[PDB]
Amino acid sequence: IEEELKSSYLDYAMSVIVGRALPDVRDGLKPVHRRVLYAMNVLGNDWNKAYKKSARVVGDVIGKYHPHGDSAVYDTIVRMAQPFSLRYMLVDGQGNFGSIDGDSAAAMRYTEIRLAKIAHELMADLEKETVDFVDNYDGTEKIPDVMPTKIPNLLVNGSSGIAVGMATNIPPHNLTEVINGCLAYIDDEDISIEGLMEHIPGPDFPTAAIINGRRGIEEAYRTGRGKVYIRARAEVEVDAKTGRETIIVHEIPYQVNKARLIEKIAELVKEKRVEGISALRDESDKDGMRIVIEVKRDAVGEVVLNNLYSQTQLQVSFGINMVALHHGQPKIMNLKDIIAAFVRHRREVVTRRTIFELRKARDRAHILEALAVALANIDPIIELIRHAPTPAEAKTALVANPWQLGNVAAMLEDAARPEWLEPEFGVRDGLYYLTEQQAQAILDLRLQKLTGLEHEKLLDEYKELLDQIAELLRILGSADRLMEVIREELELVREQFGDKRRTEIT
Amino acid sequence: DYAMSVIVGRALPDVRDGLKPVHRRVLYAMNVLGNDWNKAYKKSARVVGDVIGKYHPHGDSAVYDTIVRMAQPFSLRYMLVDGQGNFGSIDGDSAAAMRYTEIRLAKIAHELMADLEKETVDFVDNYDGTEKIPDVMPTKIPNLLVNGSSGIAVGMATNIPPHNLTEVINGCLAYIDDEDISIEGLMEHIPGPDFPTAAIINGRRGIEEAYRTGRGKVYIRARAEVEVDAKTGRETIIVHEIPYQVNKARLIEKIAELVKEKRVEGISALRDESDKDGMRIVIEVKRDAVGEVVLNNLYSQTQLQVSFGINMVALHHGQPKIMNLKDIIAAFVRHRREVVTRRTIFELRKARDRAHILEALAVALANIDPIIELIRHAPTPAEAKTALVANPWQLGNVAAMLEDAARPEWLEPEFGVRDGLYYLTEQQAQAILDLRLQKLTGLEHEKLLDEYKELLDQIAELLRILGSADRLMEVIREELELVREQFGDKRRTEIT
Amino acid sequence: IEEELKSSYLDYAMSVIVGRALPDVRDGLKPVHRRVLYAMNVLGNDWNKAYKKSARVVGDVIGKYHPHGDSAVYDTIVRMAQPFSLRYMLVDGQGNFGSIDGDSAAAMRYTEIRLAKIAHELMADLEKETVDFVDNYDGTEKIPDVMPTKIPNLLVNGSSGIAVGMATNIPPHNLTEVINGCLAYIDDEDISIEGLMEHIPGPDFPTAAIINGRRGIEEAYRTGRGKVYIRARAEVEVDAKTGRETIIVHEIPYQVNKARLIEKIAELVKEKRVEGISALRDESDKDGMRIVIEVKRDAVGEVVLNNLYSQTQLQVSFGINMVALHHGQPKIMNLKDIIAAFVRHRREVVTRRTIFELRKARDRAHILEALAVALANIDPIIELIRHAPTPAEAKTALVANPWQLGNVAAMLEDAARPEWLEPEFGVRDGLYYLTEQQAQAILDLRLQKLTGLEHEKLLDEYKELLDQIAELLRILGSADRLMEVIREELELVREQFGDKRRTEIT
Amino acid sequence: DYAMSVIVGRALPDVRDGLKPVHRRVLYAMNVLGNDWNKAYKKSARVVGDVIGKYHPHGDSAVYDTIVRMAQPFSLRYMLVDGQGNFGSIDGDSAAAMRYTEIRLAKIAHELMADLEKETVDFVDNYDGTEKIPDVMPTKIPNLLVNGSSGIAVGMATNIPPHNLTEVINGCLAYIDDEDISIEGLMEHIPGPDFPTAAIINGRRGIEEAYRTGRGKVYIRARAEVEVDAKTGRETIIVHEIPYQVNKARLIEKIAELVKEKRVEGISALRDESDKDGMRIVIEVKRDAVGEVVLNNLYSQTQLQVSFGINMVALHHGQPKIMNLKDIIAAFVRHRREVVTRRTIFELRKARDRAHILEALAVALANIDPIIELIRHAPTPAEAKTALVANPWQLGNVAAMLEDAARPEWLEPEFGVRDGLYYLTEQQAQAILDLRLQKLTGLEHEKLLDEYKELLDQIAELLRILGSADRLMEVIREELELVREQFGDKRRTEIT
Ligand SMILES: [Mg+2]
Ligand SMILES: [Mg+2]
Ligand SMILES: [Mg+2]
Ligand SMILES: [Mg+2]
Ligand SMILES: [Mg+2]
Ligand SMILES: [Mg+2]
Ligand SMILES: [Mg+2]
Ligand SMILES: [Mg+2]
User: Fold this and answer.
1) What Gene Ontology terms describe where this protein resides (cellular component) (chains B, D)?
2) Are residues D226 and D202 in the same domain?
């Protein structure tokens, strides 16, 4: 704490708030988010596996990762489950998770959750040493510092929070559009903000509705700060027999409580502050919003609506203030900063992933050799172990003698060698000198394995492995090929989770 | 109405183990987590989180409160949780947050959960049917009596005070010896409640009633006395022990306030002087007042004396039953008898199955070469299983070992020894197939023949218990004696 | 605590629970109830005065009477406001006070309350020294120990609670019926339980519905304990063109959550545990319950309904267990015990009321004399005070001399004498000797009062007072006349607040 | 966005009085209740209940938490609430429940609310428009500086540390003397923050920056040192003072834990030895370790040293403004100037209206007989009012008294003295009509002529203030001086 802080105007307490309340730019999560999702991933609470009780996830989170009584654990679960909150839900919830009308979710003992399909994308390759881990509160568990997200989550799901008086307001966005942005950027590090907006014309809210005016959006994407207006989608309908005018509301601005908005209209009508309204009914159901606003016959529909736009939350403004943590500091960022931070994240992730796969590949190949060689010497080895008196003896005995690489010899004829393996081990001039750990591998293998279908199974795996090691080494060899792997991952994501824009921009 | 049964389940101690459901729920978690009395302390939040997720998914601070009370020497006569950190105190101040305190089981809690893994108690489903929970603990401790229970705070009837472990063990032995022993009989081992907080129980007829009917009222009295300062002649009342469940801070205030109101007179100063070491309430008598007089007023106007309504209502064969002292003892001895019985059946099954596997291993070993050659010949592991089972194997040097009470009862006669020909099971084929090369060193014959010889001796011993009600009672005696010895301690409460 | 408890099996803690969780038999309140209502009465939160914010009542309660953070304060307010909870609401609430569907009331800052009209009846004559007061937690305020209720509240509003394992379940009742019971009892102390049931045939729930079978009700009224079955009001309707069968539910048993009941039906239908149901809709609104249960065309309406009665809370039983605190102990009481306890309460109340009115009457009459006499001696008195140098002097001077009872003499020609007033004070043989406090009354009177319209105003009040004292003395004089005052008060209550029975008994 | 302004209002101190809204809300209630520093303590629940009902109807424990923090000597540099009972302590343990603690205003809180009833500050409506609340307090204390403020915990920017009252008063006087005084100028009166918890601020450039720009960072350092036991030679680190807002219990644990991890070495024992009397953390140095070395490690790995980010953001003319030390002083002096001005106008109106009534009384008195006879003649009190107003009254012996700056300004000229004829108002008729007989004793002339003579002297004095900017500044000086004298105290924090 003390050492590392000696050059901000920021003191320790100040930096805790920053770290807890502002999202990381690369995955758009704050620790509490990261901790819930991670706890879910550890439980195997997968999108395509049975729902677990929210309480079960709450207790894990609280026990291993977030030992405070704060409702934030459960509230975060609920929020990530609501389709009026996240443009791309990260939790798939079953039961009462509240509504657009502001009513509460059932208690954690009554709801069930699992990870949304897309959430796995956000935590893809978490086991491949792709991100740093930090200690939990008691030194007993590891927690991701950031998620290896294939999803440009901060943009797509947007953000809120405030620390040291510095607020963050990022609106949600359309995943397809954002992925296109990303690919555009990959092909042109110099692409202008204007060039990006060809792909990302503007925010895209889960609650649809309309944005009036692009000046707000441009300056937001250019500077990180800008105001934009969200307007309800509501026409006036006319009855062809009667001539009755009825305003219908299909969509409202993001973050507006539908019930509270209706209360407000009812109340303006009481106070004669808004005239011309015979009747007010919420006819919304499971299949879409429908607020019914019947116009008096002596009043004008167009006029009553316009009146409502100005006096209520049928129209609100939303101030974009794009702040995230970047390399540890809270910066204001423009649209291109945010995309670059993401693409750069993907490059780090993919590289570390590739390195890991390679080490895992080589370690397994190495082990395979020890066994292949063993299968090929069944009789000397078994007679060896059998006449040794102790496993420990069998081990130091195994290692004593190099071994005639038998029929196995062919299979070897050297990029499958562990970076850590010293030069006197391996296949030194016709013989095979064994790692002391490789002896274990042999001593550890079960009678079961001395079968016919062992040799097929192993030569096969080694074959597959070298093949893999080949392709991994070409990724590390070629920056082009590694950017290829990123484009394809992005493309794949566009295609499995991309959806139709919802908010219309005028 | 149903509301009733639920209110009742929540608050009522099971007579056998002394626990309410939330209690059993916390302690089981700690057990599952391996949070043992002799391993590193764990932060309370981890136990709380586990209990909330798997067993107790309600908002109520109940879970952490239970952990805390199990840790307070003023709460439980035999603490069930060993905790470091601030766990509040007698002045009714709060424990620290669960993220700061840390805990593990007390040695004695393991006695409460002894043999829990030997199928000795029934498990029920947890709230979402993904977990099991014991219905009662296989306790060696007569926990209800020794630790007590109360449901008064929540509107229920149960009010059982704590008791001295040695006294009660002895009680049980007296009972195991003379199942016809009277209440009076029992009362020579257990003259009365023993409170964690010492002090004095004043009078015996309440106790007698309570132990005879399950119902009676008793008086607890603070240990205090008058002191004269040798240099000045000033009198001071010093309070050393107060009645169970009285809040010191409160009591002091009741006095301060009684004094301010002229309701009690003769007091010139009021101070708490208690350490980590001793309670010490200092009440200075006025020079013109008399010590004894002030003190006797205090007894009768503050909680320096208090009544305790005994009402021994617990859960018995699924029901709230009012029970007397003999009933409660008997319910525990009966539980021990059952637990031990179940324990035994399980060790005997466990041992047999293992012996049966060990047999198959030895044989594979005395037929190493044939076997290896057989398995090598095969294409699928499948093939090698049916093959290893197709023929018998001559009981090599292995004959020595085996030659018949180590047959698991489920084994059908076409399997095992038949003519100096070992008839193999398919499961046993697996064990063989599953054998790691390392097990072919000369140190297998050894570890193996030694395990099997151990098995036979236990099996022998287990059959001896099942074959004698007496031997089984003797086991329960020994257990009870061992508890007395390892965990018994001094009476703390003086009965007049 | 210690002294007073030495003969129950009940210890101190035990007796606190009893005192807090079981209702007093005479007013049917527990302390928390009594404390909220009282706090409201003190605030003047009257039925016919503006709503105050619940929070305002909560803070009073919490500050003066009930200093615990428990939701019970606010929850009690809410419950006394809900028409599905109390047969006779004691709070008139405005805003979201929850519903039959179990959803929560808005926070205390959002709702408003005042006393219901009937609640004043419950606290009638609280200022007339009609009930004992106890100290609040800090010795700063007085709180009623019991309310001087004109309403037989325990019966009418019923009860719940549990202490030392002893539960209380009293159902609500119809006020008219209960008042008739009471009058029946007043006219015949020997009236049998059967005789009472002529008036009180059985419970009457705020949620209406039906009771099957009187054996339950009789034994409950005879012994205090008995079970009764409540059944929904639901017919099968048939469409005259189609022949479609549709079960409709208008009323459900008391204490059943409508939403949770519907969930249950939906769920039995899922599990094929109940067959024959095409559709399930709650069509309830502000104007009545309507659960729609459409029957499959190949199924029988009668059969589907009967099935639902047995598998759901469309039919429940309710175990009457009539326990209340009587003279401090928690007793099981029968129907006649409960009525007698009430009527006896009214007798105490009315007597103490009468005594009080009498003392207040006499004290005021006494004071009137001092002034009447003073008005009649304006000139000697004013010349007296004027030549005295100090108010204190004026006082001891006033008292020195008896005073020629002037024109005032007539007005006196003696049941208007304070019980506490010593024989040497008053109108001793032609002169008027003054109380030292009466001198104050004179010294205290304002120039304003020496007007013409003072003599009219005062002789008038005295006239009224003697008249009052007359009627009060006849009440204390005649046990018959005092029972009359009770009948009339009861009758009056029947007539202002009596309503139609709601539950039907079969 | 609006969410912003609200988050901001909730957390941001008004520069003039140093309070957040919830603060002003609690303190105003205590004031309304008359819960004064020299009256009986009141139970916290009564203040909490009042505040919740009239001013702060949210669930948040905020209300009781505020009361508590105002009572903690480790929290506020000048406590605003005097409380008895457990109000928690430096180890971050909790206060007792509001029903057990009791409180009243500290002497100094009255200075914060001085003249609150003299229309000296603006009131706004409370949440339901049935009550009024001051918008700011008419404080004589430069509270923001002296007591500090922080909104960091809730995501806001404000972080102002506390200061020494004497230092700041002096600062204000230096300012009142030379309105052009520099920051350097000011810093000779206020060299730095003064923490309730003493300890050491290590280095001056942070302070300088903070006071010049509103922004800068400072280091707080625990006061501790190495001791050698004369008999053994053993070294012990003794910790006496720790940085502001550090939790002792926490810090001790951080050390215990740092030790268990081999992260810091040289420690052989760790004990808290703090009384009611002194903080005393005992850290025993190993015989093979060096005191200084262990100690310097500790400084740099625990909260024995801590940074404090100063960020002087407060509310000024309705806005969050970053302000430097001169700005904050000036905003307070300006407030004093306004408050005093308003105070004066009000006393002058109050005094005049009262004088005007007193006049009418005197006259009624010198025309007692005529008047009495007039009122007696009447039928309705109404009649007697129009009658008493119909004619003038000769200014009897009363002439002496009156014979012209005691006319309330609102009085129109057809009323009062006109020719040796007193022209009565209708309001004045009421006062007369309202006179109690007891007021006709010879002790009326007295109490009356004395009050009026007092009125004139104050009126005289009040006009003297309005007529001289200088005199008014001198008043503000005197006030400030008086505060310095009654409430000033020693610097506690050492600055290096
Ligand atoms: Mg953490
Ligand atoms: Mg439940
Ligand atoms: Mg359960
Ligand atoms: Mg209590
Ligand atoms: Mg109370
Ligand atoms: Mg709000
Ligand atoms: Mg407000
Ligand atoms: Mg913290």
Assistant:
1) chromosome; cytoplasm; DNA topoisomerase type II (double strand cut, ATP-hydrolyzing) complex
2) no
